[PDB]
Amino acid sequence: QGTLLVLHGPNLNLLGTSTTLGQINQDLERRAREAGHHLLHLQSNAEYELIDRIHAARDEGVDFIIINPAAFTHTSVALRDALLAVSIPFIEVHLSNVHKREPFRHHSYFSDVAVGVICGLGATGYRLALESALEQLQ
């Protein structure tokens, strides 16, 4: 029934270069497909590429977003506003537990407008957000 888009923010191209981004993406696509949905993804170190991808999603039939903004979590109001502009619900994912880290990482420009948040559960957090999204879509 639906289309999901997974967005990965900056530096995540280095993951497991220990699970890689490619491994995460293939597992998500597989699980989405088994449940009858279509899943797309993009990683970028460029804020504008992520913004543009979100704008495209509005005009392409995307029903739900799963985003790991990574360092942009704490900085990119522009990505927050892209999500809000297109009115596509999303779940925020973080690999590491930000509460264990520097105070600046405790603030997110996403969390208050996300459906929910998964933090600190490593690469598995993405598939957990996908389980949630599949329910949210019914």
Curated annotation (Swiss-Prot):
This is 3-dehydroquinate dehydratase 1. The gene is aroQ1. Catalyzes a trans-dehydration via an enolate intermediate. SUPFAM superfamilies: Type II 3-dehydroquinate dehydratase. It holds the Pfam family DHquinase_II. It catalyses: 3-dehydroquinate = 3-dehydroshikimate + H2O. Homododecamer. InterPro entries: DHquinase_II (IPR001874), DHquinase_II_CS (IPR018509), DHquinase_II_sf (IPR036441). It is an enzyme of class 4 (lyase). HAMAP family: AroQ. GO terms for biological process: amino acid biosynthetic process; aromatic amino acid family biosynthetic process; chorismate biosynthetic process; quinate catabolic process.
